[PDB]
Design a binder for this molecule. Structure first.
Ligand code: CL
Ligand code: CL
Length: 124
């Protein structure tokens, strides 16, 4: 009951802000995107660009994925992103995250028809 594309959108897209506000962005977004349900998702990145700009990456620079697959693509430009990672004080169900805002290239795995992002691999 979620497509790979839709799961990618939910976990990784935050086009409604230009950049993480505040230290509490990650606590709020990890909860609101339902990434804290039965466990605290340990690590997650949100991208502050339009969905079209992110989708476009699937036609940009083809690079290997960490896992050796060959359907990864690296954004030609940097993009506003926020990395969310659990802190030592995080104990499910009181999940706690460090918010780190940055401008980096993103690397995504793409697939399907239409050929769209299905996994966030990394930022550089
Ligand atoms: Cl979909
Ligand atoms: Cl991630």
């Amino acid at each position: 009951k979620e497509t790979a594309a839709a799961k990618f959108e939910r976990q990784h897209m935050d086009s409604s802000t230009s950049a993480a506000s505040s230290s509490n962005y990650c606590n709020q977004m990890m909860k609101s995107r339902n990434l804290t349900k039965d466990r605290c998702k340990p690590v997650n990145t949100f991208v502050h660009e339009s969905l079209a700009d992110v989708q476009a990456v699937c036609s940009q620079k083809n690079v290997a994925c960490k896992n050796g697959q060959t359907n990864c693509y690296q954004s030609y430009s940097t993009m506003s992103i926020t990395d969310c990672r659990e802190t030592g004080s995080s104990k499910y169900p009181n999940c706690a995250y460090k918010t780190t805002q940055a401008n980096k290239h993103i690397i995504v795995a793409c697939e399907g028809n239409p050929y769209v992002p299905v996994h966030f691999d990394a930022s550089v």
